[PDB]
Symmetry: none
Subunit: 65 residues, 7 copies
């Protein structure tokens, strides 16, 4: 909704337990918006369900609905 960042975004998806990965890997929203399943696997998001939630989450966030 109101002026986004990664911490908030992960909390809105129930994925706050990936904050460490995101922090170490310096994944901002601009970066995350360019990433698919392969790339998220490269940074250690092993669960398909987590990758899916992220991928759809960031499209939703930036897409205007």
């Amino acid at each position: 909704g109101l002026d986004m960042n990664i911490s908030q975004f992960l909390k809105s998806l129930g994925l706050e337990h990936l904050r460490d990965i995101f922090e170490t890997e310096q994944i901002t929203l601009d970066v995350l918006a360019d990433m698919g399943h392969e790339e998220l696997k490269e940074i250690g998001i092993n669960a398909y369900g987590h990758r899916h939630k992220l991928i759809k989450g960031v499209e939703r966030l930036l897409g205007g609905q």
Copy 2:
């Protein structure tokens, strides 16, 4: 909508619980998945994918 473990039981697919647990597939995720995506997570039998897809769409509609 409901519990993933109970949904699998209601379809006779309790033996997929381990894949669903490892891939963190909740019901809302499953609702977005077709045959290609289910294949990606290791559901290799057509008949299993078909029951999941048809069972999750009966659950929401």
Copy 3:
């Protein structure tokens, strides 16, 4: 044995490895047309025809 009795009743018991590997049960089969049967490797029109008509007759009341 329901699916394998069913295939026997049609003379299509040699399809039983495809059906076993793909875990096709009668409820799945009852929803399949030509395209979906081609997707699982039932390549012959005649087999597909017999399967579709057989399951309709089985569940249709006679």
Copy 4:
């Protein structure tokens, strides 16, 4: 009775035997087929389909 290969031979359509064998078209299957279904398995001439359809009908007199 009579089987599919003798049947095709009797109509002068023996060159179709390989289609009928690839598609496992027995006489009981051919009996349910119209022009559209025969086009689908690659019988492209109307004349050939017409001979098959009238032939199989004759055969259940």
Copy 5:
């Protein structure tokens, strides 16, 4: 007696239909069984052509 279909066609002034008849494997035996709907299905689009064929084949064979 029955003749080469290209001759039957030439006898009705319809030689230009021979490509359709060859492709569709239409013999006189088959043509004898066809009406307007069936000849439309093989691409004889003009009523006047179908009419000549249907009568032509009655004249030729029925007689």
Copy 6:
């Protein structure tokens, strides 16, 4: 374009040391993937990703 203004345009000024020590010019960066960037000590995927996009954007 030069190295200093490239890194600043991506928010990666803090990398200038690594690029200086390793004598990474833009011609060289252009040929580097994730593995090669890992080799020079750029450990964050996010940074490598920005470097790789940035330099590809630069040579259209």
Copy 7:
């Protein structure tokens, strides 16, 4: 081709002396990776990369 003119074409004329001391001919350079060029004192990734690419072009 001569080693002096090779380093001129890559802008690495300041390595002339490491190459002279270590007797690195182009036939030897062809065999060398990153590990091996580090062993003879070429500390910068970018210089190693240029040498590797340059020789493997010829």
